[PDB]
Every structure is written in C-alpha cells, then in structure tokens.
Design a protein around this ligand. Structure first.
Ligand SMILES: C[C@]12CC[C@H]3[C@@H](CCC4=CC(=O)CC[C@@]43C)[C@@H]1CC[C@@H]2OC(=O)CCC(=O)O
Ligand SMILES: C[C@]12CC[C@H]3[C@@H](CCC4=CC(=O)CC[C@@]43C)[C@@H]1CC[C@@H]2OC(=O)CCC(=O)O
Length: 115
C-alpha cells in the first residue's frame, strides 16, 4: 500500500467546513500532524496552526481524523515564522499529513465555494 492521503469534501468548501482527512500506507504507529497549507510563493508554503490537529497511524499505516478548513487564515512557515494572511480563494491551498520530520504523502488540493 503506497503512501496516500484523501480529503473529502475537497471542493465547495466554506470557512468552517469540517472535512475528513484520511491516510494510508503511512508509518505504522507514527504521529502525523494534520493541517491546511498554501503556497504563498514559489517553493514556499505556509500553514494554519490555529486549526491543526494530530493523528497516529495504526499498526496498518492507516489514520483518519477531521479538520476545520478556513477560506483565509494567518499563515506560518514550516519553522513557525509568521508569514501573513493567506486567501485560499486565489492561493493554492491543500490539506496534508506530515510527521515530526516533515515526511508524509502528497497533500490534497482544496477549493472553496464561489457563490
Ligand atoms: C517542519 C517540520 C515538519 C512540519 C511540522 C513541524 C512542526 C509543527 C507542524 C504542525 C502542523 O500542524 C503541520 C506540520 C508542521 C509544520 C516540523 C518541525 C520539524 C519538521 O521538519 C523537519 O524535520 C525538517 C526541517 C528541514 O528540512 O529543515
Ligand atoms: C513545508 C514542507 C514542504 C512542503 C510540504 C509540507 C507538508 C505538506 C505538503 C504536501 C504536498 O503535497 C505539497 C508540499 C507540502 C506543502 C512540508 C512540511 C515540512 C516541509 O518543509 C521543510 O521541511 C523545509 C521548508 C521547505 O522544504 O521549503
């Protein structure tokens, strides 16, 4: 089972929508942070610590939890440095699982309601 992550719903989201985040093929017994990310610049991503969460992969490398997404949020860099406001209406945002060393499967892109 290859490392993968699934997020649903992933489209038609609103600020406050709760999504299901699931991971498979992960490190058995490893704790994974669940967070919303955004590419704030080429090769630069910021996340939303204000609504982050954590989940530990089971003996089978599977995990699943919930996450509240935000249309816009105060983004922080990987090292905790404050970046600034991020608007997922335009910015490319995703939800991802990452362990303490920054490893984990590819994040899943998300989009918000346009109405
Ligand atoms: C940034 C990091 C991976 C992403 C982590 C971060 C700790 C805090 C954190 C909380 C979240 O909600 C998402 C993941 C994340 C933002 C980790 C601390 C070290 C780890 O990265 C590395 O081990 C390698 C660092 C590097 O390559 O310089
Ligand atoms: C931010 C990050 C690189 C970009 C990652 C992010 C985890 C979530 C994520 C999922 C993707 O599929 C796209 C990249 C990305 C958004 C990582 C968590 C730690 C890692 O970073 C660093 O270790 C050092 C900074 C860097 O690599 O530029």
């Amino acid at each position: 089972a290859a490392p993968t992550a699934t997020v649903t719903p992933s489209s038609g989201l609103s600020d406050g929508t709760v999504v299901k985040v699931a991971g498979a093929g992960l490190q058995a017994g490893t704790a994974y942070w669940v967070a919303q990310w955004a590419r704030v610049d080429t090769g630069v991503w910021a996340y939303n610590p204000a609504d982050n969460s954590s989940v530990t992969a089971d003996a089978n490398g599977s995990a699943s939890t919930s996450l509240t997404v935000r249309r816009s949020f105060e983004g922080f860099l990987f090292d905790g440095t404050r970046w600034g406001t991020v608007d997922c209406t335009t910015a490319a945002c995703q939800v991802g699982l990452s362990d303490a060393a920054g490893n984990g499967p590819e994040g899943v892109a998300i989009s918000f309601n346009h109405h």
